[PDB]
Each structure stands twice: as structure tokens, then as C-alpha cells.
């Protein structure tokens, strides 16, 4: 009955905790002792992208690192040129409510989703040049939180209902559905090889999904409130979460626990975006109180603040090569830092 | 200007697009946006069907003005994550059925929803238009089913005028922000031609009391 199986669950989840304590022998802050500190990090703005007329919810850099895409609470979905402040495309959406966007690796498609429970895939390079809807994906109970392109013919999505899914663009039907969450999923991030990904729910937990098989492999606890932003250590063996606990964490995939926590007394506001720098020595973080920070990944100490914004920093992302960091707050502007 | 000939036309394209952006952002500020919230079997459809998945959207025009309502009750997910998208809506329209007060008990659910939304941080500024509909059956349930079922404490005698005003004072006494916002209640039966005129009559009070606040006159 239910009583016996629930009793068994306590034993299995007590076998795990006594199997995650025989591995820990030294924290990350003892290994990294007598290691030279990073030092003051001073960064000034280089651009200001002022096209939008209302709040901005998502952004994603092109692979070449010279083009940007940006979604706001307006019909428009703008494609920016980061070297010179120019617009290359303006797209009018079919629904004013947008909570995500994405830019394909090959550079031939964009994507967008919002509260209408539909994912739209736009096409960019066509004869009779204009931007037209190439495909409409339907079949989500709740609102789309985030999306990502595995390659030109596939895409993973995460929805308000406790589920993640994998889509094939040529034929509308899904191919694999991941259903292990309780609580709303908020964000996901793909591995560098695209053979695994990590998603963060609202029940203060995270998973580790195999794409090909369709089954979870590791479950990571530790937070107290919902999490909202995940990233991958460039190596591909660790990730870092950000929550409304006003606390980031840095888990790892081979020991299956938490190496360190970046939290400070002054901050009580929540975190909305997390990203590593190239070479995994700096972790950027966009706090709720119109500000941002830089944390020394190997040492809990904090690099200098990076605040130029006048409202919430909804989303930010480091460029693929590593030259610059772009943050877009609720006020229409996006400032690029360098 | 150290710009090749091809480079100049990319600036002329960007200044062609800034024209489209303003010329279409100046046509999206004329419309007045409203939000429609209600509980299950409260009678949202009647006022939706009165005047002309996702978030449903509706357009209606009265006496040279354009309104857009957003019926969002089909989301069926946590409201904390997506309700902060809705600031800048001119007014929230809430609607309560009076036929169901006895029926476990819906009214308390209504009260706790109107209380959660009324005191939220995002909606500190915006005003609420409270409909209280389906009063044609509420006239008949008063005699057969007494008002005491919701609250034994209430002293007053059971009259249509004496009960519905007391309920109204039960709803209007839930907002902490007396100074910041007001509530514009209105009784409506199943059929009332005048319903849209009360919304057009109250949004102008909201717009004037915000225009005399933007310049510090108040």
C-alpha cells in the first residue's frame, strides 16, 4: 500500500545522504588556500541599445558574438548589432506577452515564447527578404519559461506545467517528454556538447536530464526557495544556480553535491540571472535591486559591483568568445559592459 | 565620415526602423488596457458576452475610445511568477456572483482572492472596479435562505436593500490603501445595457486622477 512504499522512500533518501558524506573530505575553501586573489575588477559601459519602448524579458547572443536578439513587452522582437548601434531586424509578434527568446547556433532561426503556451520559430534568411513565421509549436499546458536550440532541427522547452519537452521542428509532434518535476520549471541550460541539460524547478530542486534516453540521472537539493537561473561551468562538469533565497550555489556533477555558496548580508533581494565568464573564474549575477555583481568562483570574496542600471536586471549574458557582457534591465536600455 | 558606401545604407535602414517603432508605439498607447479577474462560476462570461490555452484578449469600443480586456483565468498555474507582467494596466475588474453565498462556501474563497490581489505590491497604484452580478436570483434566495449562513454575527434584518449593502461594506473594507486607491462598486442583473457606461464613467475618473498626480498638482 501507500504506507509501505512511503516508508521505503525514507530509507532510500537516507541511503543517499549517507552516500554523499563519505565523498566529502575537504571543502572548496580549504583547497584554495594561499592562492592569489583576483583583485579589483573595474568595467565601464561601451554601448547603449535604446530601441525598445517597454520592459525587456530575455536576451541571447548570436554564436559569432556580434549579433543580439531581444524580447520585450511589445509586439517587437529586435535583432541588434553589438559593434555599431544598429538594428538589423524588427519582428512583430502575434502576442504581446513574451517571456523568452533564443537565437540559433547556425544563425538561421530565432524563437520566442510567452504566456500564450505556444513556441514560435521565425526564419531569417529567405528570398523575398522579410521575416516570416516558419513554424508554430503547440502542446503546452502552461506558459513557456525558457527555450534552447540543440541544433537547427531540434529544440528543448520548459513550461509552467511541471514538464520539459523536446521538439522536432520539421514535424510539430514532440519526440521525448521529461516529467519528474513538482512545481513550475523556470529555466534550463544546455551542456556544451548538447548531450545533457539542467533545469531548475520552483520546488527548490534541479535535475540532470539525458537527452537521448529521456530519464533523469541526478537530483540536487540545497536551496530554500525557488530558483530562476542556471548556467554551466565552461568545462561542462559543474553548474551554478541562482534563487530567491538571495544565494547562488556551485554544484558539481561527479561528486553530486555542493562545493560553495555565494551570499552576503547586505543582499536580501532575489537573483534573476547567473552566468560564468570564460575560463570559469568569475560568476556574474543579476540581483533584483537594480544592480549586479561579480563573484570570484574559486574564493567566496566578491569582485567589484557592476551597477549602472535604473531598475531590475531581468537578463544578462557573456559573449561566446568572452569580450563583453550585456545586461538588459526593465528600463528599455541594454548596456554592454567591457 | 570613415563610413563605406555600403555602411551608410545600414544606418539609413536603422533610421527607417526607428520610424516604424515610434509610429506603431504611438498607436498602442491610445488603447486603454483592463484586466478581468473572477472566480469559477462567478459570471465573467456574462460581462464578456455583454460587450462584443493562453491569455484571452478582447477589444471593444464605446463613444470614440478603445478598450482591451485580458481574461487570464485559464492559466491554471502559480500566479506569483507571471502577475508582475501586468503593471500599467489601467484598472482591474473583479466580479462576484451574489447567487452563491450559501453554496464548501465560495464567498470566502472570493474574499481571499480579492484580498490577495488587492494588497499586492505591483497593484499598489491601480484601482478596482467591482461588479456584483446575478442579483435576479439573489432577490429570491434572501427569503428562503437567510444571510446568516455566511455570518451569524450580522444583526440586521434580511431585506434585499439591507443585505446587499452590508455585503458591499464587507468587500470595500479589505483594502489597506485607502489613500492610494478606491473601489467603484456597481450592482448588475443578468441584463443591463448601462454596464459599459459605468466602465467608461470610471476610467475617466482614474485617468484624471492620474493626470493630476503626474504633474504634482495633487
Amino acid at each position, epitope marked *: 500500500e501507500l504506507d509501505q512504499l512511503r516508508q521505503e522512500a525514507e530509507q532510500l533518501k537516507n541511503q543517499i545522504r549517507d552516500a554523499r558524506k563519505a565523498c566529502a573530505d575537504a571543502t572548496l575553501s580549504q583547497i584554495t588556500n594561499n592562492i592569489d586573489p583576483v583583485g579589483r575588477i573595474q568595467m565601464r559601459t561601451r554601448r547603449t541599445l535604446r530601441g525598445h519602448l517597454a520592459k525587456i524579458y530575455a536576451m541571447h547572443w548570436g554564436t559569432d558574438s556580434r549579433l543580439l536578439v531581444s524580447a520585450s513587452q511589445d509586439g517587437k522582437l529586435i535583432i541588434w548589432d553589438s559593434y555599431t548601434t544598429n538594428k538589423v531586424h524588427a519582428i512583430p509578434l502575434r502576442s504581446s506577452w513574451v517571456m523568452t527568446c533564443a537565437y540559433a547556433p547556425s544563425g538561421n532561426y530565432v524563437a520566442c515564447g510567452g504566456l500564450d503556451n505556444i513556441c514560435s520559430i521565425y526564419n531569417l534568411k529567405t528570398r*523575398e*527578404g522579410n521575416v516570416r513565421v516558419s513554424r508554430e509549436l503547440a502542446g503546452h499546458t502552461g506558459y513557456l519559461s525558457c527555450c534552447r536550440f540543440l541544433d537547427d532541427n531540434q529544440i528543448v522547452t520548459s513550461s509552467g506545467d511541471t514538464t520539459c519537452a523536446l521538439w522536432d521542428i520539421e514535424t510539430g509532434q514532440q519526440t521525448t517528454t521529461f516529467t519528474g518535476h513538482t512545481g513550475d520549471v523556470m529555466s534550463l541550460s544546455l551542456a556544451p556538447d548538447t548531450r545533457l541539460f539542467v533545469s531548475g524547478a520552483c520546488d527548490a530542486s534541479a535535475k540532470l536530464w539525458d537527452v537521448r534516453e529521456g530519464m533523469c540521472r541526478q537530483t540536487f537539493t540545497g536551496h530554500e526557495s525557488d530558483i530562476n537561473a542556471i548556467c554551466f561551468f565552461p568545462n561542462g562538469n559543474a553548474f551554478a544556480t541562482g534563487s530567491d533565497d538571495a544565494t547562488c550555489r556551485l554544484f558539481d556533477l561527479r561528486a553530486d553535491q555542493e562545493l560553495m555558496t555565494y551570499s552576503h548580508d547586505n543582499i536580501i533581494c532575489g537573483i534573476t540571472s547567473v552566468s560564468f565568464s570564460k575560463s570559469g573564474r568569475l560568476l556574474l549575477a543579476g540581483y533584483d535591486d537594480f544592480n549586479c555583481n561579480v563573484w570570484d568562483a574559486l574564493k567566496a570574496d566578491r569582485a567589484g559591483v557592476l551597477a549602472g542600471h535604473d531598475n531590475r536586471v531581468s537578463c544578462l549574458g557573456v559573449t561566446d568568445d568572452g569580450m563583453a557582457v550585456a545586461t538588459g534591465s526593465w528600463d528599455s536600455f541594454l548596456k554592454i559592459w567591457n | 565620415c570613415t563610413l*563605406s*558606401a*555600403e555602411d551608410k*545604407a*545600414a544606418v*539609413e535602414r536603422s533610421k*527607417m526602423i526607428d520610424r516604424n517603432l515610434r509610429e506603431d508605439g504611438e498607436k498602442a498607447a491610445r488603447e486603454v488596457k483592463l484586466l478581468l479577474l473572477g472566480a469559477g462560476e462567478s459570471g465573467k462570461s456574462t460581462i464578456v458576452k455583454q460587450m462584443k490555452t493562453g491569455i484571452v484578449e478582447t477589444h471593444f469600443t464605446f463613444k470614440d475610445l478603445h478598450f482591451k480586456m485580458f481574461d487570464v483565468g485559464g492559466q491554471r498555474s502559480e500566479r506569483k511568477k507571471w502577475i508582475h507582467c501586468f503593471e500599467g494596466v489601467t484598472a482591474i475588474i473583479f466580479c462576484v456572483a451574489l447567487s452563491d453565498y450559501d453554496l464548501m462556501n465560495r464567498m470566502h474563497e472570493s474574499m481571499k482572492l480579492f484580498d490577495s490581489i488587492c494588497n499586492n505590491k505591483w497593484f499598489t497604484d491601480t484601482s478596482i472596479i467591482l461588479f456584483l452580478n446575478k442579483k435576479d436570483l439573489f432577490e429570491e434566495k434572501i427569503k428562503k435562505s437567510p444571510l446568516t449562513i455566511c455570518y451569524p454575527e450580522y444583526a440586521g434584518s434580511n431585506t434585499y436593500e439591507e443585505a446587499a449593502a452590508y455585503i458591499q461594506c464587507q468587500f470595500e473594507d479589505l483594502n489597506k490603501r485607502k489613500d492610494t486607491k478606491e473601489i467603484y462598486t456597481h450592482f448588475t442583473c443578468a441584463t443591463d445595457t448601462k454596464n459599459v457606461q459605468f466602465v467608461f464613467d470610471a476610467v475617466t475618473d482614474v485617468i484624471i486622477k492620474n493626470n493630476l498626480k503626474d504633474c504634482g498638482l495633487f
Partner: single-chain antibody
Amino acid sequence: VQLVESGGGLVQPGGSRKLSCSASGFAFSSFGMHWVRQAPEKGLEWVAYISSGSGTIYYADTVKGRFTISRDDPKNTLFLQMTSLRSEDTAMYYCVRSIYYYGSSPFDFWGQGTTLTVSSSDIVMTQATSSVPVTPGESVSISCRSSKSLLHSNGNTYLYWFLQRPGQSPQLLIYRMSNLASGVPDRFSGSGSGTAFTLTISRLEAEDVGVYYCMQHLEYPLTFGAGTKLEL
């Protein structure tokens, strides 16, 4: 995505005929437009231009003040009106489309043109090989030279290549240095440096036997190079 043109015919000198070009199949309101003429046997030449929105109009030197170009966006038509035609204004008039943003391909599609018979400090491009014989399956290289450094400070060198098969309109092959126009076989490739250029065909079939042209697009007025005819 066809562009059809009309006008032409036989005109006595001094009488001004007009030319129309009726587009159908694309978004006409966001493309710049051109006109390119070809004399009876000579290489192409650049008559005029218009930007998007008719906000910027240029001209050539020999028609500056004699021709007037104008566009009609709602009716999808491009007009060129000629005035007091001279005996040396006899040429077929093609009509060329072009869009300018980051990463686009100008001169991607060309009209078929009309035939007009009037009765009776500039960058010099150079290619000086004509009627070069070729055999299918060989590797053929064709060279070009310019009179000024086409390499701009930003790293783009503005040099376009084209191909006119006998009896057809010309066709874009390489949009800039080290680039391949979409829709063309991968055989073609071109590598330059400074002001020396070349186009190389690794293994050619017998379908591409036609004249090749080369254009600088760096600054107006867009000169073209002489012809280079491949004979079989």
C-alpha cells in the same frame, strides 16, 4: 520573384521616352534599386540608384541631370524617365535589386531588361584576358586588378563578381572577398589580397561558358571591369 520591364523601342534623338519596371513576388518597400545598361557588345555600366523610402538618390556622371529615377511603393513599380536622349544612349537597361544590412547579399537578383535604340577621380577596374579557351574538367583561374585599395579599415573588401551566359541576364557569384552567393555551386571560389584578385573554378562543366564581370562597390559611382569571355 520576377521583375519585368517595359519601354524601349525605337526613339529619334531628342525625344524623351520613359521606362517602367513592375516588381512582383517580394517585399518591394525595403529594397534599394539600381539600373544597369549594356551597350551592343560592351561591358555593363551603372546608370542610377534609389535607397529605401526614396530618401537617397545618386546618379552616374554622363547622365547627371538628364535622367530622373523615382519609385512607386503602393503600386510596386520603379520608373526611370529619360530626357533628350543622345545617339550614344543605346543600350539594354537591366534593373537590379539590392538590400543593405549586416550580412546581406546586394545585387542578388537581376531583371531581364528592355532594348532601347535611339535612332541616328574614379576607381578604374581592369581585367585584360579575353576569349580564353577552356576544356571541361579543367581548373581555370581569371584575374582582376584595381587602381585603389578596396580594403576598408573594418576588414571588408568590397568586390563583387558576376556571370552572363549567352542570352540571359547576369547572376551574382561572389558578394565580397571570400564569400559564395547563395544558390550557386560550390565550385567557384575567390581569394584576393590588397588590389589583386582572382576567381577559380576547380572542375567546370560546360554549362558555365559565359562572360565574367567584376565590380567595386566601395564608393560611387560603381565602375565595372571589362569582359572576360570563356570560349569552348
